[PDB]
């Protein structure tokens, strides 16, 4: 299978928002758990994102689509975002977000 993450690059600016879009492709099973991971520009440590507030996730299992809008972008938010589809992860290749 694979996850189809989009866009592969977003240089947004501060105050703006970002919607990353994932879809579970060519997979015989449906969509179950989902998950997002920042890698803060600075470190190699990939860290789970905890959905709430500025980050708002929308899941359409059925179309195997899921999505994260990050509202009110800060400079602190620049980094590489990956989504995860679980039933074994399988992960999109990420969005290199660059802010301000």
Residue 43 CA neighbour count, 13 Å, CB half: 9
Domains in the chain, number: 1
By residue range, what is the domain housing residue 68? 1-100
Backbone angles phi, psi at 77, to 5 degrees: -85, -15
CA separation, residue 45 to residues 22, 42, 72, 79 (Å): 22, 9, 24, 12
Longest dimension (CA), the chain: 41
d(CA 20, CA 11): 12
Start-to-end CA span in the chain (Å): 35
Burial 52-82 (b: 16+ CB within 10 A, else e): eeebebebeeeebebbbebeebeeebbbebb
CATH number of 8's domain: 2.60.40.10
d(CA 28, CA 6): 22
Resolution (angstroms) stands at 2.8
């Amino acid at each position: 299978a694979w996850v189809d993450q989009t866009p592969r690059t977003a240089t947004k600016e501060t105050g703006e928002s970002l919607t990353i879009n994932c879809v579970l492709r060519d997979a015989s099973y449906g969509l179950e758990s989902t998950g997002w991971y920042r890698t803060k520009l600075g470190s190699t440590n990939e860290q789970t994102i905890s959905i709430g507030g500025r980050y708002v996730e929308t899941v359409n299992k059925g179309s195997k689509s899921f999505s994260l809008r990050i509202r009110d972008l800060r400079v602190e938010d620049s980094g590489t975002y990956k989504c995860g589809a679980f039933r074994l992860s399988e992960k999109g290749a990420g969005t290199v977000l660059t802010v301000k």
